[PDB]
Design a protein around this ligand. Structure first.
Ligand code: ATP
Ligand code: ZN
Ligand code: ZN
Ligand code: ZN
Ligand code: ZN
Ligand code: ZN
Ligand code: ZN
Ligand code: ZN
Ligand code: ZN
Ligand code: ZN
Lengths: 405, 20
């Protein structure tokens, strides 16, 4: 994801002399003894790298083909999403096929239980939603989106929705079970992650948001509570409860207080930039051990967010602070992720200079942290929750509201 | 210190989404 042509200010079909002339022009501009502004040095190097590729016919051809490969990969990803989105899977299991073992986690809307498939012995994580509660909390459209979207996406860091079904009382979403627990509990116990450790997680979220956004999807509930650690130490994003397909802007006030972008708080029509703001909060909390805006009452949290005055621990690197100033940018029109160069302003930021983006995508990087275990059903990486009886009424509830589920 | 203030604060536990 480097834009060599744009770096030199060129069109894709530029000639060799145009490439030479553009490199020379751009070079003079950032030359170390005629430009001593911050990061001019880093641009002087980027212009040289772009020239070395484009000025060599073999390497330029490789780069041009790679641009075509990426476009074709995106076309297949859009195809796969649209086919699944336009004709959603339904009714792919039912309740008494699963032995319910233990509650793994709860949220504002649902209960997630470790279950075991009676026939195969395989373990899964089943999210249970009470239809009447969903209606009361005004989450009908959100819950319909959640299921429809999660089973239509496919990415290495997105949890898989394996089965779904419904009965008189409840909605059920049966996911792959991610056994290493929430990032949240590890982060709180450990205190904070070192910058390379935080960067490892951050890079997975960057690729995941690049993927979702390329399908016109926004996620809207990034937080360590919704991030699970798998057996290889990689991230699995769960909780698509606020995921939505948006071309243009959307208007719902939703999210989790510490992670709300300012434009959501100010009731503005907002877009994919809110996900990039949330990434700033996540990276800050991962590396500091506490979020950039906190207070006892969410009203006071919201007042801090929209001022967006932010202070950094003195142990934060200069590159980390610079990245965070650009992600935690209160003006969405200036926020990294939302500029002309899109996700590349982030991927090519200095703080990510050591990140091998293709190796992260391929899961070839050794994780900084591997969760401990003691068996295929061990749950000790999760807190304990009070257990509650799953009751199914003899009368169907909210039949019309959830017809498409 | 700020981390000290945070771990002695009221919002160190899991944060559920807003239902508003
Ligand atoms: N696939 C999974 N594997 C293991 N545990 C999971 C999985 N999905 C969710 N959990 C656990 O269940 C918890 C609640 O699930 P989820 O966040 O989807 O519920 P919610 O009601 O939508 O919460 P929120 O208040 O964040 O909107 C998660 O925080 C996590 O601990
Ligand atoms: Zn397909
Ligand atoms: Zn198992
Ligand atoms: Zn997975
Ligand atoms: Zn660490
Ligand atoms: Zn959640
Ligand atoms: Zn949720
Ligand atoms: Zn409520
Ligand atoms: Zn309440
Ligand atoms: Zn309330």
């Amino acid at each position: 994801g480097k834009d060599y042509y744009q770096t030199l200010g060129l069109a894709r079909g530029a000639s060799d002399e145009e490439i030479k002339r553009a490199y020379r022009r751009q070079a003079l501009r950032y030359h170390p003894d005629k430009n001593k502004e911050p990061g001019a040095e880093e641009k002087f190097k980027e212009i040289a790298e772009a020239y070395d590729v484009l000025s060599d016919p073999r390497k330029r051809e490789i780069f041009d083909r790679y641009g075509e490969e990426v476009k074709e990969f995106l076309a297949k990803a859009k195809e796969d999403f649209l086919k699944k989105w336009e004709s959603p899977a339904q009714n792919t299991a039912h309740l008494d096929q699963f032995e319910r073992i233990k509650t793994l986690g709860t949220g504002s809307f649902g209960r997630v239980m470790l279950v075991k498939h009676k026939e195969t012995g395989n373990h899964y994580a089943m999210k249970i939603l009470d239809k009447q509660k969903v209606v009361k909390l005004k989450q009908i459209e959100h819950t319909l989106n959640e299921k429809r979207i999660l089973q239509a996406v496919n990415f290495p860091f997105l949890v898989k929705l394996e089965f779904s079904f419904k009965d008189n009382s409840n909605l059920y979403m049966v996911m792959e079970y991610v056994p290493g627990g929430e990032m949240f509990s590890h982060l709180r116990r450990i205190g904070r992650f070192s910058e390379p450790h935080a960067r490892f997680y951050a890079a997975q979220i960057v690729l995941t948001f690049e993927y979702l956004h390329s399908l016109d999807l926004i996620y809207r509930d990034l937080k360590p509570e919704n991030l699970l650690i798998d057996q290889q130490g990689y991230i699995q994003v769960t909780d698509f409860g606020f995921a939505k397909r948006v071309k243009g802007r959307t208007w719902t006030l939703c999210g989790t207080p510490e992670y709300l972008a300012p434009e959501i708080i100010l009731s503005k029509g907002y877009n994919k930039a809110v996900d990039w703001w949330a990434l700033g909060v996540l990276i800050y909390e991962m590396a500091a051990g506490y979020p950039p805006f906190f207070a006892d009452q969410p009203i006071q949290i919201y007042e801090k967010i929209v001022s967006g005055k932010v202070r950094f621990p003195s142990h934060f690197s200069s590159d980390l602070k610079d990245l965070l100033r650009n992600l935690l940018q209160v003006d969405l029109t200036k926020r990294f992720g939302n500029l002309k160069n899109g996700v590349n302003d982030i991927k090519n930021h200095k703080w990510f200079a050591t990140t091998d983006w293709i190796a992260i995508y391929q899961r070839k990087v050794e994780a900084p942290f591997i969760p401990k275990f003691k068996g295929p059903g061990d749950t000790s990486n999760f807190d304990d929750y009070e257990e509650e009886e799953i009751r199914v009424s003899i009368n169907e509830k909210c039949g019309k509201e959830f017809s498409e589920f | 210190t700020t981390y000290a203030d945070f771990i002695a604060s009221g919002r160190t536990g899991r944060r559920n989404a807003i239902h508003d």
